[PDB]
Design a protein around this motif. Structure first.
Motif, PDB file in Angstrom:
ATOM      1  N   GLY A 233     -69.638  59.284  44.441  1.00 58.51           N
ATOM      2  CA  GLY A 233     -68.629  58.363  44.949  1.00 58.51           C
ATOM      3  C   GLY A 233     -69.083  56.918  45.083  1.00 58.51           C
ATOM      4  N   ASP A 234     -70.246  56.611  44.522  1.00 58.33           N
ATOM      5  CA  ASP A 234     -70.794  55.259  44.565  1.00 58.33           C
ATOM      6  C   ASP A 234     -70.297  54.386  43.405  1.00 58.33           C
ATOM      7  N   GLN A 235     -69.921  53.145  43.704  1.00 61.84           N
ATOM      8  CA  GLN A 235     -69.450  52.245  42.656  1.00 61.84           C
ATOM      9  C   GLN A 235     -70.625  51.599  41.941  1.00 61.84           C
ATOM     10  N   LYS A 236     -70.544  51.525  40.618  1.00 64.81           N
ATOM     11  CA  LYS A 236     -71.577  50.834  39.855  1.00 64.81           C
ATOM     12  C   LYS A 236     -71.023  50.228  38.574  1.00 64.81           C
ATOM     13  N   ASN A 237     -71.705  49.198  38.084  1.00 62.24           N
ATOM     14  CA  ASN A 237     -71.347  48.588  36.808  1.00 62.24           C
ATOM     15  C   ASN A 237     -72.062  49.299  35.672  1.00 62.24           C
ATOM     16  N   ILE A 238     -71.398  49.411  34.526  1.00 63.28           N
ATOM     17  CA  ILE A 238     -72.013  50.030  33.354  1.00 63.28           C
ATOM     18  C   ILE A 238     -71.790  49.198  32.107  1.00 63.28           C
ATOM     19  N   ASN A 239     -72.777  49.216  31.232  1.00 68.62           N
ATOM     20  CA  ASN A 239     -72.702  48.476  29.991  1.00 68.62           C
ATOM     21  C   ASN A 239     -71.867  49.256  28.988  1.00 68.62           C
ATOM     22  N   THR A 240     -70.814  48.622  28.486  1.00 71.57           N
ATOM     23  CA  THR A 240     -69.915  49.260  27.531  1.00 71.57           C
ATOM     24  C   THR A 240     -69.768  48.418  26.255  1.00 71.57           C
ATOM     25  N   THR A 241     -69.024  48.931  25.281  1.00 74.51           N
ATOM     26  CA  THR A 241     -68.787  48.196  24.034  1.00 74.51           C
ATOM     27  C   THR A 241     -67.297  48.220  23.744  1.00 74.51           C
ATOM     28  N   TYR A 242     -66.718  47.059  23.458  1.00 75.56           N
ATOM     29  CA  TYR A 242     -65.293  47.004  23.183  1.00 75.56           C
ATOM     30  C   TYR A 242     -64.994  46.915  21.688  1.00 75.56           C
ATOM     31  N   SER A 243     -64.188  47.854  21.219  1.00 73.86           N
ATOM     32  CA  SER A 243     -63.583  47.797  19.896  1.00 73.86           C
ATOM     33  C   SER A 243     -62.366  48.699  19.961  1.00 73.86           C
ATOM     34  N   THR A 244     -61.211  48.082  20.210  1.00 75.80           N
ATOM     35  CA  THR A 244     -59.953  48.779  20.517  1.00 75.80           C
ATOM     36  C   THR A 244     -60.005  49.497  21.868  1.00 75.80           C
ATOM     37  N   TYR A 245     -60.962  50.409  22.010  1.00 76.79           N
ATOM     38  CA  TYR A 245     -61.263  51.047  23.294  1.00 76.79           C
ATOM     39  C   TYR A 245     -62.566  50.492  23.848  1.00 76.79           C
ATOM     40  N   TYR A 246     -62.832  50.791  25.121  1.00 76.94           N
ATOM     41  CA  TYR A 246     -64.133  50.524  25.721  1.00 76.94           C
ATOM     42  C   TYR A 246     -64.940  51.806  25.665  1.00 76.94           C
ATOM     43  N   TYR A 247     -66.070  51.754  24.969  1.00 72.15           N
ATOM     44  CA  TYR A 247     -66.905  52.932  24.775  1.00 72.15           C
ATOM     45  C   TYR A 247     -68.139  52.892  25.664  1.00 72.15           C
ATOM     46  N   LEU A 248     -68.599  54.065  26.096  1.00 69.53           N
ATOM     47  CA  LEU A 248     -69.874  54.141  26.811  1.00 69.53           C
ATOM     48  C   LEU A 248     -71.015  53.973  25.817  1.00 69.53           C
ATOM     49  N   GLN A 249     -71.251  52.716  25.472  1.00 69.19           N
ATOM     50  CA  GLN A 249     -72.295  52.324  24.543  1.00 69.19           C
ATOM     51  C   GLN A 249     -72.924  51.057  25.106  1.00 69.19           C
ATOM     52  N   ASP A 250     -74.173  51.185  25.542  1.00 73.56           N
ATOM     53  CA  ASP A 250     -74.924  50.111  26.178  1.00 73.56           C
ATOM     54  C   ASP A 250     -75.822  49.482  25.118  1.00 73.56           C
ATOM     55  N   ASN A 251     -75.488  48.265  24.694  1.00 72.95           N
ATOM     56  CA  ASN A 251     -76.244  47.597  23.642  1.00 72.95           C
ATOM     57  C   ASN A 251     -77.394  46.770  24.183  1.00 72.95           C
ATOM     58  N   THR A 252     -77.564  46.779  25.503  1.00 74.15           N
ATOM     59  CA  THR A 252     -78.569  45.918  26.131  1.00 74.15           C
ATOM     60  C   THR A 252     -79.954  46.549  26.181  1.00 74.15           C
ATOM     61  N   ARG A 253     -80.039  47.825  25.814  1.00 73.06           N
ATOM     62  CA  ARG A 253     -81.301  48.553  25.912  1.00 73.06           C
ATOM     63  C   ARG A 253     -81.645  49.190  24.576  1.00 73.06           C
TER      64      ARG A 253
ATOM     65  N   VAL B 212     -68.906  44.800  30.253  1.00 75.48           N
ATOM     66  CA  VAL B 212     -69.399  45.451  31.461  1.00 75.48           C
ATOM     67  C   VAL B 212     -68.224  46.075  32.196  1.00 75.48           C
ATOM     68  N   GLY B 213     -68.223  47.405  32.264  1.00 73.09           N
ATOM     69  CA  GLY B 213     -67.198  48.142  32.972  1.00 73.09           C
ATOM     70  C   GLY B 213     -67.635  48.441  34.388  1.00 73.09           C
ATOM     71  N   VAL B 214     -66.740  49.061  35.142  1.00 75.45           N
ATOM     72  CA  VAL B 214     -67.046  49.434  36.516  1.00 75.45           C
ATOM     73  C   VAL B 214     -66.436  50.802  36.785  1.00 75.45           C
ATOM     74  N   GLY B 215     -67.096  51.603  37.607  1.00 72.86           N
ATOM     75  CA  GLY B 215     -66.549  52.904  37.929  1.00 72.86           C
ATOM     76  C   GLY B 215     -67.254  53.511  39.116  1.00 72.86           C
ATOM     77  N   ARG B 216     -67.008  54.796  39.356  1.00 69.29           N
ATOM     78  CA  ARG B 216     -67.700  55.504  40.424  1.00 69.29           C
ATOM     79  C   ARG B 216     -68.419  56.727  39.869  1.00 69.29           C
ATOM     80  N   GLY B 217     -69.608  56.995  40.398  1.00 71.55           N
ATOM     81  CA  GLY B 217     -70.374  58.150  39.977  1.00 71.55           C
ATOM     82  C   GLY B 217     -69.988  59.407  40.735  1.00 71.55           C
ATOM     83  N   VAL B 218     -70.723  60.480  40.452  1.00 73.75           N
ATOM     84  CA  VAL B 218     -70.478  61.803  41.016  1.00 73.75           C
ATOM     85  C   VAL B 218     -70.463  61.823  42.552  1.00 73.75           C
TER      86      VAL B 218
END
Ligand SMILES: CC(C)C[C@H](NC(=O)[C@H](CC(C)C)NP(=O)(O)CNC(=O)OCc1ccccc1)C(=O)O
Ligand SMILES: [Ca+2]
Ligand SMILES: [Ca+2]
Ligand SMILES: [Ca+2]
Ligand SMILES: [Ca+2]
Ligand SMILES: [Zn+2]
Length: 316
Positions: free
Chosen positions: A15-35, A7-13
């Motif tokens: 300026g709001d902070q939100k958590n996002i589902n990511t996948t770790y393999s060397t890098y953290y990818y925008l890949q949400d495996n929960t859905r 679970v990563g964290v960042g800011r949207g367009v």
């Protein structure tokens, strides 16, 4: 890719902070495996080759300006998935948990977003007409809804069927915006349209005529621009949907509102059980009346309100 869910964290367009589902393999990818079978977000790198590269980040923190459109495309795709699953018992756009793919930073100064037959695509805007378009939850849901439509009714993207296609995307885009319950309204694209102008939007469902669009069948566009007016004549159906949910008196015809949840049920049923690729507005009325009848009974208020609304916009 194969990796572990994180679970990563960042800011949207905006300026709001939100958590996002990511996948770790060397890098953290925008890949949400929960859905379903995953939500995947890609960087198009200001070019037009699609999908581009699966979004990779070194530290799972997404606070750079360049990150913001990716954060929102990814997060709002998740919200839209949740809406379809929780509200309509639909698993992704195909009903079988198809992977959901989005690309951001498409092209340069690109004032649009679209479903290309296989994935969602978002421009960054030119900074004047638009800011990055994935910043609008209604926009993201509008685009994913095109996929839902293509897998179901399959409404051809021209003329009346195309205007229905468009209205379905605006209707569910709006219902998802209400579902997330952050500054919801019956306007389209207000969060990302014209940063220099407050209070405007790309379209209005409550009063389509304020942004140039018809609110009655007698005012339908019959020319060839915009695939025969798919984003114009959508106003006629958007108005009907607005009236079904919220009520009102329009050209002297009063409609008793039945609320957003029933609007959603009636139109979801129409979309998935009655509409066909060539349905026209009259056929949409019949589909909605039948859907309301299935759900609430032929003598119900719900059926009466659907009829009132189509009457009010001149669709028999
Ligand atoms: C000024 C723009 C954004 C208005 C309008 N686009 C829209 O209303 C929304 C974006 C909006 C909710 C921000 N984009 P859309 O998904 O309806 C554009 N459709 C579009 O691109 O369709 C053509 C197409 C068909 C098949 C494959 C690829 C492309 C338009 O294309 O005219
Ligand atoms: Ca980072
Ligand atoms: Ca809003
Ligand atoms: Ca909106
Ligand atoms: Ca604006
Ligand atoms: Zn559209």
């Amino acid at each position: 890719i194969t990796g572990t869910s994180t679970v990563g964290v960042g800011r949207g367009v905006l300026g709001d902070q939100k958590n996002i589902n990511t996948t770790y393999s060397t890098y953290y990818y925008l890949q949400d495996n929960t859905r379903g079978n995953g939500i995947f977000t890609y960087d198009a790198k200001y070019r037009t080759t699609l999908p581009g590269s699966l979004w990779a980040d070194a530290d799972n923190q997404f606070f750079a300006s360049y990150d913001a459109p990716a954060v929102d495309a990814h997060y709002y795709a998740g919200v839209t998935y949740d809406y379809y699953k929780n509200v309509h018992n639909r698993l992704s756009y195909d009903g079988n948990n198809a992977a959901i793919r989005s690309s951001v930073h498409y092209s340069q100064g690109y004032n649009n977003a679209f479903w290309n037959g296989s994935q969602m695509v978002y421009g960054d805007g030119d900074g004047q007409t638009f800011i990055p378009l994935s910043g609008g939850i209604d926009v993201v849901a509008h685009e994913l809804t095109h996929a839902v439509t293509d897998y179901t009714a399959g409404l051809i993207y021209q003329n009346e069927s195309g205007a229905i296609n468009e209205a379905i995307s605006d209707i569910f885009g709006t219902l998802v915006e209400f579902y997330a319950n952050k500054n919801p309204d019956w306007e389209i694209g207000e969060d990302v349209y014209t940063p220099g102008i407050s209070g405007d939007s790309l379209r209005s469902m409550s009063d389509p005529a304020k942004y140039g669009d018809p609110d009655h069948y007698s005012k339908r566009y019959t020319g060839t621009q915009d695939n025969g007016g798919v984003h114009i004549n959508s106003g006629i159906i958007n108005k009907a949907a607005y009236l079904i949910s919220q009520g009102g008196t329009h050209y002297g015809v009063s409609v008793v509102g039945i609320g957003r949840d029933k609007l959603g049920k009636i139109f979801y049923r129409a979309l998935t059980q009655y509409l066909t690729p060539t349905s026209n507005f009259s056929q949409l009325r019949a589909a909605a009346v039948q859907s309301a009848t299935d759900l609430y009974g032929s003598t119900s208020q719900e059926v009466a309100s659907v009829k009132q609304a189509f009457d009010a916009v001149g669709v028999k």
